[model samples]
Target: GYGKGYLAMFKNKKVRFKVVNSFPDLKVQFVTSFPDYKVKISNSSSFCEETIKIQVVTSFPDVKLQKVTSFGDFEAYID
Candidate 1:
């Protein structure tokens, strides 16, 4: 699978991420441009029925929906 990526965000009305990364581990700040839509995650290992809907966000509190099948699914991974 090439160019495969996932953007899982929003559930249970909130989101929590540990961000296991490299050294320094500086206190990073996340800012967004959408704060109207509803996007949140309850726990990391979580999933739910596919909500075929798009939410317009305007800030950090807002979350982006995950993209499962691009352009109508029926995919087989092409490089």
Candidate 2:
């Protein structure tokens, strides 16, 4: 959460979020809370556009993946 804006470079986009534990069931709650953004989870451990699993949800597009990597843990959120 501290390094919030450290993963994106889009204009006129704002993401208001708090970092939380990445539980196995996190993505379910994530989509429930933020219906505006299409969320996904994966087994990968990298922070980049290539690491983003392509989710073709017509409701959301022009998406950006923001991930904060510290230690062996990672915290990712939407942008």
Candidate 3:
């Protein structure tokens, strides 16, 4: 089963994603297809639910993401 806790992060209509190299709040894997949930990039964080500072390192990611799939935690699409 996927992590519900992680899915909760997307409860808000808008979310902030900060890309980092180290010490990330969460780890995420990028897939071409079959994503867990879809993500819409927001221009501003003022109307976002929360800022998600993330890292792009292999291994130990908080969730596995695909471009158009969702069965792990959630999937997202960058716009």
| Among all candidates shown, the one with the greatest lDDT | 3
Model 1 RMSD in angstroms? 13.4
TM-score of every candidate relative to the true structure: 0.20, 0.23, 0.59
Give the CA lDDT, 0 to 100, for residue 64 in model 1.
32
Q: Comparing 2 and 3 by TM-score, which wins?
A: 3
Give me candidate 3's TM-score against the actual structure.
0.59
Error of 3 at 55 (Å): 0.3
* Candidate 3 residue lDDT tens string, 1-79: 2252665656535556678777766677766665455544434446555566677756666765554322333223222
- Check candidate 2 and list the clashing pairs: none
Model 1 — TM-score against the truth? 0.20
For candidate 3, the lDDT comes to: 0.55
User: What C-alpha lDDT, on a 0 to 100 scale, does residue 38 get in candidate 1?
Assistant: 25
Candidates in order have lDDT scores of 0.26, 0.30, 0.55
Q: What is the C-alpha RMSD of each candidate to the true structure, in Å?
A: 13.4, 12.7, 5.3
Model 2 quality (TM-score): 0.23
* Model 2 lDDT tens row, 1-79: 1122332332223222333334211222223333323333333444433222233333433333433232212233332
Residue range 18-48, candidate 1, lDDT tens digits:
3423331112222333222223333233334
